[PDB]
Amino acid sequence: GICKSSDCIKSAARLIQNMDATTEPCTDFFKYACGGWLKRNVIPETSSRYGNFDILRDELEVVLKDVLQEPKTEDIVAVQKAKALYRSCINESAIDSRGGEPLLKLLPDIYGWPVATENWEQKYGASWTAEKAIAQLNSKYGKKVLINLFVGTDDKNSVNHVIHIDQPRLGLPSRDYYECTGIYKEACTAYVDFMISVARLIRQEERLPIDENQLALEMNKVMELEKEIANATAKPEDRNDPMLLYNKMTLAQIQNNFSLEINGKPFSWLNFTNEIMSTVNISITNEEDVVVYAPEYLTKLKPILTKYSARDLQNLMSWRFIMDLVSSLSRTYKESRNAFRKALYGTTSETATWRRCANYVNGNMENAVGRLYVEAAFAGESKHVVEDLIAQIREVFIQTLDDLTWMDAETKKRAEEKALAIKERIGYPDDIVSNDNKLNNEYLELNYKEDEYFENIIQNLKFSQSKQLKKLREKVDKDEWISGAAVVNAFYSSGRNQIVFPAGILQPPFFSAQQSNSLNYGGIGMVIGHEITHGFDDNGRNFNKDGDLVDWWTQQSASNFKEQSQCMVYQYGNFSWDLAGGQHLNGINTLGENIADNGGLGQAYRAYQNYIKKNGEEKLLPGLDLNHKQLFFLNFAQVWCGTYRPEYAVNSIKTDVHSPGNFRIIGTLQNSAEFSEAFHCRKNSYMNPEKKCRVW
Ligand SMILES: CC(C)C[C@H](NP(=O)(O)O[C@@H]1O[C@@H](C)[C@H](O)[C@@H](O)[C@H]1O)C(=O)N[C@@H](Cc1c[nH]c2ccccc12)C(=O)O
Ligand SMILES: *[C@@H]1O[C@H](CO)[C@@H](O)[C@H](O)[C@H]1NC(C)=O
Numbered sequence: 097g098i099c100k101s102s103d104c105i106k107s108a109a110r111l112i113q114n115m116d117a118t119t120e121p122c123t124d125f126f127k128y129a130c131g132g133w134l135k136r137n138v139i140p141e142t143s144s145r146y147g148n149f150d151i152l153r154d155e156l157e158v159v160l161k162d163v164l165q166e167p168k169t170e171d172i173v174a175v176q177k178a179k180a181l182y183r184s185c186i187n188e189s190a191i192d193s194r195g196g197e198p199l200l201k202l203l204p205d206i207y208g209w210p211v212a213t214e215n216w217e218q219k220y221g222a223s224w225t226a227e228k229a230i231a232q233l234n235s236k237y238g239k240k241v242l243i244n245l246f247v248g249t250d251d252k253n254s255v256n257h258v259i260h261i262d263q264p265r266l267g268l269p270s271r272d273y274y275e276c277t278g279i280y281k282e283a284c285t286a287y288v289d290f291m292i293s294v295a296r297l298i299r300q301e302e303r304l305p306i307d308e309n310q311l312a313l314e315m316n317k318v319m320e321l322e323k324e325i326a327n328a329t330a331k332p333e334d335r336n337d338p339m340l341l342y343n344k345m346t347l348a349q350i351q352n353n354f355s356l357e358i359n360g361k362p363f364s365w366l367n368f369t370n371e372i373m374s375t376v377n378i379s380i381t382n383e384e385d386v387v388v389y390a391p392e393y394l395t396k397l398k399p400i401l402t403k404y405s406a407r408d409l410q411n412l413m414s415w416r417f418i419m420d421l422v423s424s425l426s427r428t429y430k431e432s433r434n435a436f437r438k439a440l441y442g443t444t445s446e447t448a449t450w451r452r453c454a455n456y457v458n459g460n461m462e463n464a465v466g467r468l469y470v471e472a473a474f475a476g477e478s479k480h481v482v483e484d485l486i487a488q489i490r491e492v493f494i495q496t497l498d499d500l501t502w503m504d505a506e507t508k509k510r511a512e513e514k515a516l517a518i519k520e521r522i523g524y525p526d527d528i529v530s531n532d533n534k535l536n537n538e539y540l541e542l543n544y545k546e547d548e549y550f551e552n553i554i555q556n557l558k559f560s561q562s563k564q565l566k567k568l569r570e571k572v573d574k575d576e577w578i579s580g581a582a583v584v585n586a587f588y589s590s591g592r593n594q595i596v597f598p599a600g601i602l603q604p605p606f607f608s609a610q611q612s613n614s615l616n617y618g619g620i621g622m623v624i625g626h627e628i629t630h631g632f633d634d635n636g637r638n639f640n641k642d643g644d645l646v647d648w649w650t651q652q653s654a655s656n657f658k659e660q661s662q663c664m665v666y667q668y669g670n671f672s673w674d675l676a677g678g679q680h681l682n683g684i685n686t687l688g689e690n691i692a693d694n695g696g697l698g699q700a701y702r703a704y705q706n707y708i709k710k711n712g713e714e715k716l717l718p719g720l721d722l723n724h725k726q727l728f729f730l731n732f733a734q735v736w737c738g739t740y741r742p743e744y745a746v747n748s749i750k751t752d753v754h755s756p757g758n759f760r761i762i763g764t765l766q767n768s769a770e771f772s773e774a775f776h777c778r779k780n781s782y783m784n785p786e787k788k789c790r791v792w
């Protein structure tokens with residue numbers, strides 16, 4: 097009664113080669129599940145992290161390279177553009193011959209970069225204004241510095257867009273890096289050195305004198321500036337309640353409550369907003385509704401900015417944009433980023449050009465690239481099987497509502513309502529393959545020159561920003577997908593209340609219409625449950641069936657949610673990560689993801705049990721002395737096999753809201769009675785603690 101098919105032997109060999117049977121499953125399931133893989137692999141010099149997900153990404157890029165590198169006579173314009181963009185990106189000779197020339201041409205359009213400019217105050221300082229300079233970078237290039245103003249979906253009215261004001265991203269991975277000592281010292285040093293290196297290259301190219309001390313003096317001041325801005329930003333832990341972050345105010349209330357004086361101005365929120373919106377010829381009055389996500393940051397900002405000159409501010413502002421462009425310039429410019437990237441990612445080399453390029457055009461033309469990808473690698477008949485798995489897991493979610501003792505009937509009803517309303521998106525939107533007109537029109541305004549990569553990326557920046565700003569008065573498009581098809585990942589959108597499973601993730605180990613169901617439910621089944629459960633985590637639970645930020649929880653049920661969640665906050669907060677130097681994970685920042693993991697795996701298991709009851713046991717896999725309940729958990733764990741570079745581990749423990757793969761495995765299985773039952777784990781064995789967390 098052993099399956100001897102090609103498909104069964106492929107998956108069995110993979111499972112067998114990845115696992116380490118010499119490790120007791122109940123002592124450490126990550127080692128048991130991934131030990132074979134760990135011993136065989138070493139993180140590539142160009143990778144920050146390596147494992148199942150990254151391997152799948154590398155493989156998807158091979159497909160992209162295959163479909164983009166060769167022109168085909170019957171290619172529609174949309175496809176011709178993606179290939180021309182790809183070609184401009186991989187032509188390093190053409191790029192290298194241009195030096196930093198394309199950047200130099202750009203500088204005057206962003207008020208320059210003081211350090212690499214002679215007499216900046218006379219040239220730009222004369223007509224300079226915080227409102228114009230910040231707006232220029234924001235509206236033409238998408239670079240949000242000092243004050244992040246953007247057009248997005250109204251948290252409280254899903255169908256509309258509204259202007260949002262929030263704190264900006266930083267040059268370093270997170271606000272923590274700015275302590276600049278111990279584990280962060282090399283990063284801060286490399287960052288300032290990086291600033292200095294680029295300023296030096298620009299000066300040498302522009303034929304300007306180079307005073308090393310002056311370069312150091314100016315760049316250290318931008319670091320001093322950003323340190324203050326970093327310290328002023330609110331921690332992620334204080335931004336995890338959607339209800340509290342949402343503060344709708346009029347531009348008048350903003351001008352009144354959040355005064356700012358820069359370079360002796362004062363700051364005009366109306367002028368700043370219009371300097372931005374004018375790009376799309378949209379006028380704003382002081383009566384305009386704005387959602388402020390960082391009122392405290394704006395408040396703390398006032399005293400900070402008065403201590404700095406227009407020159408200091410612009411040195412940081414242009415730097416933040418320039419650091420993102422340097423890798424699109426000649427080799428000399430590319431090399432200046434070496435120490436910085438090693439400090440942040442641990443990588444000693446850049447990823448292959450063709451891979452960075454495939455990724456770049458996939459990210460900028462997701463529908464065009466998605467179309468080629470699915471035609472080359474996705475079997476349309478998979479969509480149906482997946483549709484069915486989703487129907488099954490959604491059902492299991494609803495059924496489980498009855499067993500949950502911590503919620504009252506009224507709240508369970510609304511939870512059921514929300515669950516039923518979840519809209520699924522599987523594989524790719526049929527339109528990208530069947531509607532050539534629409535696909536072409538999406539890229540109509542884009543015209544790529546094969547020998548001008550830099551001009552091409554700048555055009556994409558302007559186009560994407562214009563497209564975004566133009567949405568202010570428009571309604572949110574219902575049929576719009578939140579992800580391209582050639583992506584190895586899955587998502588959940590609170591505002592649209594939808595789950596998306598791109599074609600890129602509908603492949604082994606996650607799914608295959610031909611692999612054993614235990615594997616399917618353990619992989620993609622768990623993924624579907626993860627996404628659905630996001631609609632009910634510490635963030636998602638705050639949004640209703642239509643994606644509106646509104647409370648549908650009774651005070652008691654809301655209170656019980658936090659109590660049940662707290663168990664996971666402490667559980668994960670207690671895991672110490674060796675790669676990150678023994679630091680503990682952030683149980684609060686990873687809460688949502690941990691809830692999704694734990695809820696999702698149980699939901700998938702429940703669904704698998706339903707499948708077995710209704711269909712009977714499956715033929716076992718050859719070479720594995722494990723039954724299907726055990727294979728279910730083995731596959732789930734192998735989805736997460738992987739490892740991290742120390743430098744990137746220090747980065748991800750701060751920036752990744754997901755727990756590292758090994759802890760996603762250990763944490764989830766520790767809370768699973770089904771797992772311990774499947775592997776006969778003794779009580780209190782490492783993988784089977786008496787105390788188990790559970791929310792969904
Ligand atoms: C269950 C898994 C298949 C999908 C699941 N996606 P999900 O958490 O819904 O969503 C992800 O994280 C969110 C915080 C962001 O808002 C999303 O845009 C998305 O990046 C996840 O753990 N994604 C992780 C793991 C992962 C997916 N693709 C990867 C590629 C490389 C490395 C890791 C990954 C991530 O995005 O990191
Ligand atoms: C790269 O660009 C240069 C300059 O335009 C050109 O001579 C060369 O043909 C291009 N190489 C390829 C492979 O297209």
Ligand SMILES: *[C@@H]1O[C@H](CO)[C@@H](O)[C@H](O)[C@H]1NC(C)=O
Pocket residue numbers: 225227367368370371374
């Ligand atoms: C913004 O204010 C400046 C004065 O600093 C003015 O020159 C400019 O025209 C104003 N822009 C808009 C869009 O009102």
Ligand SMILES: *[C@@H]1O[C@H](CO)[C@@H](O)[C@H](O)[C@H]1NC(C)=O
Pocket residue numbers: 665666667668669670680683
């Ligand atoms: C670790 O778990 C204990 C037990 O509940 C908890 O009291 C403590 O706060 C946790 N520590 C962290 C860092 O989460």
Ligand SMILES: [Zn+2]
Pocket residue numbers: 626630689692
């Ligand atoms: Zn998630």
